[PDB]
Structure 1
């Protein structure tokens, strides 16, 4: 018999299977279509989602009800210290897919990235890249030969980089290594740029710009085994249902005599990789720039870090990306920011954003103040204040 009343299906079937991510750092599956006109630059960056905060700005879209009026918007502040370039991996294109040809590493690797190559760094002999850093001796003849072979056969050039996670307040000292594709001149220009930038840092203000429309790629917040009612949003069964009501009633008809794949079933929720596109940047701050939490209208002496630090994370002391709206993943988690895959010419994305006020009130509850100076002025001198 036909379904008596039609209803849209629960959940999205294009995000299956809802299993855990392969690793805690989501892979950038696709990269912007390279053109060989603009100078060589990275097509992504690695950061750590510090948290969220509130901002005020003038909406600047003609024809709207709020044109030239205040709006309050939620933004996510991502801690993004400059990433160190450590290796160049060349890619040839084969009928079986793009295949890596060779990787050439830098002579000296930092301890925080050498930790990535061990699971038991505390007791390891730390021999990684010993017989490779010895290959840079005698003016690196093999290294230059390998780079020449990369130029000879390399259709796409990606650079291995890692985050200076020791700059973050995270407890983990094992850095994350990632491949970011170089978009720019020819293969020789790309590899020459990477060789110049061996064991050298790249800061965010050189890859991203203000009002740029980016994508955030990250593994979402894990939630363990979850019932169908919250995992797919199916209707809860009536209150008087035997054997429980947080289920799906009919999991399929008699024929086909199998449970269909498209049926909501209990399983893991969260901890999947997610690429969320079209988030606009609102401010690319500088870590060494104190009072970066103020604006031309605010003009206070407060940094982006709220009072009492970002909850569960700490303070912000490096270059950050303040991106409008939420991004997948929770705090402390690495997130890969990426340039937009298409030229988004919509008037919602072509706006010029000038932040009018950046909140710094404590995220640890309902705090009333932005700065300790403001709090002291409002509350007067306390007994502990002596």
Structure 2
């Protein structure tokens, strides 16, 4: 078949490395190039086709939709890069002096046996009155032309049985790299909302390690046009309540997800399937380009999401509907 994914050798790391990024923005302010999350699972979506000239215009359309868990990303550092004949080089790096336990644990494999005496000499130095620390920022600003921001997932919010986080370097495209570094510093230890990185109808793309069929699979993959249908928030009740049906419920299937915890945090719905599987980290990017076409220009018209249980068959969408139709039982009044 295709020799571009051969040899059939397992990837080096579960986390999918991001290679390319957009170039620059001359006028717009600092913006995040990409976002990351975890694959919650897959469900079904039904809407009305507003795509112009469609044979099924204004007719119902059903397609599988993946749910990605995207807890608020938090910034913990900034990395400066300088152009060289050998390519980009990270000449300097800096932290925020308040690394969360989720990040400190990633620096160990025996955290239980570890003395946990990390980020002390630098943190104590960082605790000084700036003077020493500002030298690195000034050096980065003087020479660096591309700046990357270190981020990690708030695994504590997710239901995964994992405390260690992962560090991902995210690039920025805003001009006047001095503005970029100033913005990065002002956001140290702060979180960025999901809605502030991506919006509805965006033709973003995602990359993740596919499921291992076992050495088939388990490799890094990419696919463009992973359109986001609707971004949801865990605190904003009625996320599963679509625009049309507006049924009071949540996207979490009855009885939770198959071999995965219940979704109770920020999440995004993406058209079609996505690489990887449940309990796997994924990354999101804007495809590095703009897919100018009427397919992108259309708008979402979500009508209903399949939230039935996946254990056995399913006759109900929410517990409120089951009790009314099924009535009482032995285990009830």
- Show CA shifts across 1:231-281 (max 9, x none): xxxxxxxxxxxxxxxxxxxxxxxxxxxxxxxxxxxx921110111211100
The alignment partner of 1:340 has SS state of coil
**Aligned residue number for residue 25 of structure 2:** 35
- Show CA shifts across 1:364-383 (max 9, x none): 23211111010111111111
Instruction: Spell out structure 1 runs of 4+ moving beyond 6 A.
Output: none
Alignment equivalent of 2:87, drawn from 97, 100, 110: 97
Structure 1, 278-287 or 353-362: larger mean CA deviation? 353-362
Note the residue ranges of structure 2 that are not aligned, 5 or more in a row.
none
Structure 1 residue 363, shift from structure 2 partner: 2.4
Aligned-residue Cα RMSD (Å) equals 1.2
Structure 1 residue 129, shift from structure 2 partner: 0.8
Note the residue ranges of structure 1 that are not aligned, 5 or more in a row.
1-10, 224-266
**Distance in 2 (alpha carbons) for counterparts of 1:85 and 1:355:** 33
Give the structure-1-normalised TM-score.
0.84
Structure 1 residue 350, shift from structure 2 partner: 1.7
The alignment partner of 1:14 has SS state of coil
Structure 1, 66-75 or 293-302: larger mean CA deviation? 293-302
For the 8 Å contact 2:207–2:283, the answer to whether it is kept is yes
Give the structure-2-normalised TM-score.
0.97
- Show CA shifts across 1:256-307 (max 9, x none): xxxxxxxxxxx92111011121110001111111111102322222111111
The alignment partner of 1:205 has SS state of coil
Structure 1 residue 162, shift from structure 2 partner: 0.4
For the 8 Å contact 2:97–2:127, the answer to whether it is kept is no
The alignment partner of 1:143 has SS state of helix
Structure 1 residue 92, shift from structure 2 partner: 0.3
The alignment partner of 2:83 has SS state of strand
**Distance in 2 (alpha carbons) for counterparts of 1:340 and 1:312:** 31
The alignment partner of 2:295 has SS state of coil
**Distance in 2 (alpha carbons) for counterparts of 1:137 and 1:383:** 63
Structure 1 residue 140, shift from structure 2 partner: 2.2
**Distance in 1 (alpha carbons) for counterparts of 2:174 and 2:310:** 41
Matches within 5 A, 1:142-291: 142-223=132-213, 268-291=215-238
The alignment partner of 2:4 has SS state of helix
**Distance in 1 (alpha carbons) for counterparts of 2:132 and 2:223:** 42
**Aligned residue number for residue 14 of structure 2:** 24
The alignment partner of 1:310 has SS state of coil
Larger C-alpha radius of gyration, 1 or 2? Answer: 1
For the 8 Å contact 2:24–2:175, the answer to whether it is kept is no
**Distance in 2 (alpha carbons) for counterparts of 1:380 and 1:365:** 20
The alignment partner of 1:279 has SS state of coil
The alignment partner of 1:167 has SS state of coil
The alignment partner of 2:156 has SS state of helix
Structure 1, 184-193 or 278-287: larger mean CA deviation? 184-193
Structure 1 residue 161, shift from structure 2 partner: 0.4
Structure 1 residue 169, shift from structure 2 partner: 0.7
For the 8 Å contact 2:52–2:294, the answer to whether it is kept is no
**Distance in 2 (alpha carbons) for counterparts of 1:143 and 1:305:** 46
Give the paired residue count. Answer: 333
